[model samples]
Target: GCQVLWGVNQWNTGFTANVTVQNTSSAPVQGWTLTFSFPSGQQVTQAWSSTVTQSGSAVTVQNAPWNGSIPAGGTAQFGFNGSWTGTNAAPTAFSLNGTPCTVG
Candidate 1:
């Protein structure tokens, strides 16, 4: 019973991130992809995403456990680390299975 948005110093760095992977969709969700928009221009130094792709002011992280399907109204959590140059603000966009994950 531990589905929470939590993270630790996996790399022992000051910068840490806790993520909440929720299935807000009406159907089961797989092949998760999270897109983060860093406004402060912080470059990603090191990352350990299943598959990461970057394109100009945006970074997308793919989920590894495809077997872990997030059912409707259910949620899963994972996290990663990022180093900052100036500011540490949350990203503007998040997506799951190519579907946009909106924040409220």
Candidate 2:
């Protein structure tokens, strides 16, 4: 099992998002992928600590080789830069390894 945590920092049209994935299962996670949608028209422009891709309004993030393994009760973090219009509403949901993750 796994859990996802999300957060965002916005300034005008630019924003930064931080996503942390926690391993809750008894074993370590070798790798992970996170997916989410931007409801407020936020577009990711750059990223670090992971490989980031966007299609339409949906975004996907995959762990980097150096930070892929996560022990039980441990966490991995990834961040991104984005631009938004009108309102910069945070994403309300996320998925890890194709499973829904709890929002904290």
Candidate 3:
């Protein structure tokens, strides 16, 4: 009873990302956390609409208090800012509420 979508925008030495969390279950999702990994030398520096944190190559962005609820069949959007070097590649996988989300 879950689904997620992820996307990114690259620019010069940094990038932006948009993640949409869709609750496919019959009930609303109270809160959600998304985790992913970045390519070598890429790191999240700033973000909007979510709390951003990083550990080495892994990054986690969770919904802000005012934007976490997603009614059944609905979605919420969050975004971030990151810096990169060498190369920038979209995260190949995503997890929401501890479950893997479908990549598109």
Candidate 4:
């Protein structure tokens, strides 16, 4: 079980985001790969605490070198800086590996 809490701070042409991943299941999460889609013309310019790649409007982030494992009821987090045009709407959904995350 996975849940995602997403945050965004927008300013004209750019924004920053902080995301948290919670392991809601009783089992442990070994490594994390967070995936999301940019609803508009959003592009990640720089990031921290994670490695990100994008293709078209889809973006994926892998756990950083220092943080990987997440225990039951525990959480892992990361943040990034990004640019946008036309709209800077927060992503509509998120996933951890192949599991869908309860996002809001």
Pick by TM-score: which candidate is best?
4
Q: Write the per-residue lDDT of candidate 1 for residues 56-78, one digit (tens) a residue.
A: 77877676654356777787655
Q: lDDT by residue for model 4 over 1-104, one digit each (tens)?
A: 89988887889889999989999989998889999899888889998888999899999999998889999999998999999888788887888889888975
Stretches off by above 4 angstroms in model 3 are none
Point to the candidate with the largest lDDT: 4
RMSD of each: 4.7, 1.1, 1.6, 0.9
List runs of model 1 lying over 4 Å from the truth: 1-14, 46-50, 66-68
Writing each residue's lDDT as its tens digit, candidate 3 over 1-104 gives 66657677888898887777777778888888888888666878888888989999988888898998889888888888888887887777778878787764
Q: How accurate is candidate 4 locally (lDDT)?
A: 0.89
lDDT of each: 0.59, 0.87, 0.81, 0.89
lDDT of 3 at 70: 84
Residue 61 local lDDT, model 4: 96
Reference-based TM-score of each model: 0.68, 0.93, 0.87, 0.95
Global fold similarity of model 2 (TM-score):
0.93
